[PDB]
C-alpha cells in the first residue's frame, strides 16, 4: 500500500468523443491502480448503481481483468441497461448477461454531447433477425428485409434501413438528453490480480 501505479480513467470518463451503441469501443485495462474517489466525488452523477458488489467497498477489492465500455444513449432507456432487462437498446445493440458482476455509471452530459442539430454522429439500430448474444458487437449494415420479400440495394416498403438516429438538442427534455453510459465488467477474484485499488490502512 504505497501506492505506486495509476490507470487512465480520465481517458475514458473525460474522452471528448464516444462511439454510438452499434460499435461501442470496449477498452480492456490491465496493470492499473484506479481510485474511484475522484469518480464518485464528482457532482453531476445522477445515476450510480452497482450490482455485483456494493459501491462502498470497491476500494478494497482486486480485479482479474476489467473491460470499460462507453457510449451515449437517451435517458428513457437508461434503466434498460440493467441485467436481464429487455426492450430495444438492451435487445438489438448491446445487452448484459444475468451473471453480470461489474456495474454501470450513467449521467447527463448536455455540455458537449448535446447537438443543436441533433444526433447525426450516433444512432441506434432497430432491425435484426436474432437477439444478439450478450457483450457482442455488431457492425454489419445488411439491409433488413422486413416482409417475406428479399431486397438489396436501396430502401422501400418491406425493405427498411437497419439504422435509426437519435436527436439530442437542448429543446428535448429530461430523459431525451444525451446520457453518457459507461459499464465496467470484471471477474471477482478467480485469477491472479493485475488491477487493485489503493489498499487502505
Amino acid at each position, epitope marked *: 500500500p504505497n501506492i505506486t501505479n495509476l490507470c487512465p480513467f480520465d481517458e475514458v470518463f473525460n474522452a471528448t468523443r464516444f462511439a454510438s451503441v452499434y460499435a461501442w469501443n470496449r477498452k480492456r485495462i490491465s496493470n492499473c491502480v484506479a481510485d474511484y474517489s475522484v469518480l464518485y466525488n464528482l457532482a453531476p452523477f445522477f445515476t450510480f448503481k452497482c450490482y455485483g458488489v456494493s459501491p462502498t467497498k470497491l476500494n478494497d477489492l482486486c480485479f482479474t481483468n476489467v473491460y470499460a465500455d462507453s457510449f451515449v444513449i437517451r435517458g428513457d432507456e437508461v434503466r434498460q441497461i440493467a441485467p436481464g432487462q429487455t426492450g430495444n437498446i438492451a435487445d438489438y445493440n448491446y445487452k448484459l448477461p444475468d451473471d453480470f458482476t461489474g456495474c454501470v455509471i450513467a449521467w447527463n452530459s448536455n455540455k*458537449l454531447d448535446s447537438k*443543436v*442539430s441533433g444526433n*447525426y454522429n450516433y*444512432l441506434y439500430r432497430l432491425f435484426r433477425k436474432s437477439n444478439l448474444k450478450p457483450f457482442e458487437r455488431d457492425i454489419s449494415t445488411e439491409i433488413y428485409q422486413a416482409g417475406n420479400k428479399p431486397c438489396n440495394g436501396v430502401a422501400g416498403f418491406n425493405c427498411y*434501413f437497419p439504422l435509426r*438516429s437519435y436527436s439530442f438538442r437542448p429543446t428535448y427534455g429530461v430523459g431525451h438528453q444525451p446520457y453518457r453510459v459507461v459499464v465496467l465488467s470484471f471477474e471477482l477474484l478467480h485469477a491472479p490480480a493485475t488491477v487493485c485499488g489503493p489498499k487502505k490502512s
Partner: antibody
Amino acid sequence: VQLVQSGAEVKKPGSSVKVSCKASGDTFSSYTFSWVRQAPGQGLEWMGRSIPIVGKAIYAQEFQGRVTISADRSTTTVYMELSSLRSDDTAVYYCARDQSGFDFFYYDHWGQGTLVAV
Amino acid sequence: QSVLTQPPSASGTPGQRVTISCSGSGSNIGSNTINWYQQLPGTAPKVLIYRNNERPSGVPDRFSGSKSGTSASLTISGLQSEDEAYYHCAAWDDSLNGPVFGGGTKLTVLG
C-alpha cells in the same frame, strides 16, 4: 477540407436539375450537409439539410416535395434534384459542411457552389 | 424576407469605427446566438464570426461582435479598402427548426 461540385449550366423554365456536391480530405459520412441557394446579389435563405449517416433529410416547409435531396456513403456524395423551375430559381447554390452541430460554432466549412440561370 | 431584418447598405471610411446591427424576434434571436458571414464580391463567401464572441483561425481581429437580446452589433475599426462586400447575420431559428439568414448589408469602403 476540400469541397467540389458540378459546373454552371443554364436551363429553361419547366425543366429539372440534377446537381452534385463532393467533399474530400475528411470523413464524408460523419458530417451532415446543408444546401442553401442565394439569388445573385440578393439575400440568403436556407433550403435543406441531409444526413450521410442515415439518408434522412429535412427541407424548408415552404418548399416541401418540389425539391429532393439524396446522399450516398459508398460513393460519398450528395445531390439535389429540382423540379418545376422558373425565373424565381435563378440563383447560386451552396453545399455547406457543418464542423460542429452546436450553437457555439456551426456552418463554417463551406464551398463555392454552382450558379443556375433559368 | 426573413424574420431577421437588416438595413440594405452600410458605409465606412478608412480609420473610422463603424457599427452594423441585426435584429429579429425573441422567438429565435432572443434565445439563440448569432453568426456573422461575409459575402465577398464575385466568388465564394467566407465566415466572419460564430457565437458573437470567438473567431476562427487565420481571420483578422478588428471585428468586434456583441449580442444584446434582439440586437446583435458588429463594430469595425481600421476598415480597409478591400472590405466592400455583403455582410449577413444568421441564427438557428427554433420555431422552424432550421437556420435563418439576414437580409444583408452592402458595406462600401469609400476611398
